[PDB]
Ligand binder design. Structure first.
Ligand SMILES: CN[C@@H]1CCc2c(ccc(O)c2O)[C@H]1O
Length: 281
């Protein structure tokens, strides 16, 4: 008397993700005044989130609802690889946007020389290649498998599918995809906030007669809350196997997926975006 209800929530999640990503992509694509060298990163992030919502979630619903991966054996590895690829691509695009903002604020005169139209394509291709190198290559030819007695049946059985790995790939992927972007973003945003506070203090010297922290807080806190616990538990369960059950792992992995749907609600609030959105509908 509970299976039917959760399907509604999952369908709403899918619909929200798809609608948001499609709306953002259409808005930036159709209207000329919105395209910008900085705005292409938003397009890449929206494309990655749309791919995640279209592929990962609808297929992942089978495990939750039917409790039986009735699909073929070859499909599960592809599904896992595309999921990890989408996650790492989204995280790296977020880090790239943060670095772009740091460069913009820190040096205005040198900003034009550093970044041009052709640079965006090169950097996005490089980041997508480095994101996909760690997803498809180590998974397709079975570098990630474990010699432990458990999951030998899982690879052997046709009806079973769950994520078990050896003690190299989990830690390598966690280091590549989570800790470095967090360090980079924390450093650049701390410097940006310090510069903004310095300017705000300087204004009051010439105006002889902080509410700007909210934007930084909303940018940092939602991402940290969404993604921090998952990689901590991912690191911890591998080193010692009996600490973490499967249900907690699945719940954290699922709550980590909702983050991609909230990026349009946080990263496109400019008046030009709102005007385009109003004009579309
Ligand atoms: C089964 N779900 C996967 C499992 C491991 C993993 C994920 C995402 C990014 C990574 O770097 C990972 O190593 C998860 O989405």
């Amino acid at each position: 008397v509970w299976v039917v209800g959760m399907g509604i929530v999952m369908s709403l999640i899918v619909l929200a993700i798809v609608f948001g990503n499609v709306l953002v992509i259409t808005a930036i694509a159709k209207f000329e005044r919105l395209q910008t060298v900085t705005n292409y990163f938003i397009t890449s992030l929206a494309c990655a989130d749309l791919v995640m919502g279209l592929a990962v979630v609808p297929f992942g619903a089978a495990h939750i609802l039917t409790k039986t991966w009735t699909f073929g054996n070859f499909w599960c590895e592809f599904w896992t690889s595309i999921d990890v690829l989408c996650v790492t691509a989204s995280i790296e695009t977020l880090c790239v946007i943060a670095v772009d903002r740091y460069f913009a604020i820190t040096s205005p005169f040198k900003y034009q020389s550093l970044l041009t139209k052709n640079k965006a394509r090169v950097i996005i291709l490089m980041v997508w290649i480095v994101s996909g190198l760690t997803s498809f290559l180590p998974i397709q030819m079975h570098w990630y498998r474990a010699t432990h007695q458990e999951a030998i049946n899982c690879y052997a059985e046709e009806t079973c599918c769950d994520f078990f790995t050896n003690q190299a790939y989990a830690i390598a992927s966690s280091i590549v995809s989570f800790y470095v972007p967090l360090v980079i973003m924390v450093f650049v945003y701390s410097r940006v906030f310090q510069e903004a506070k310095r300017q705000l203090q300087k204004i009051d010297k010439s105006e002889g007669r902080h509410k700007a922290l909210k934007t930084l807080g909303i940018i940092m806190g939602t991402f940290t809350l969404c993604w921090l616990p998952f990689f901590i538990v991912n690191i911890v369960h591998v080193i010692q196997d009996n600490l973490i059950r499967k249900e907690v792992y699945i719940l954290l992995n699922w709550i980590g997926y909702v983050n991609s749907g909230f990026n349009p609600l946080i990263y496109c609030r400019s008046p030009d975006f709102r005007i385009a959105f109003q004009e579309l509908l």
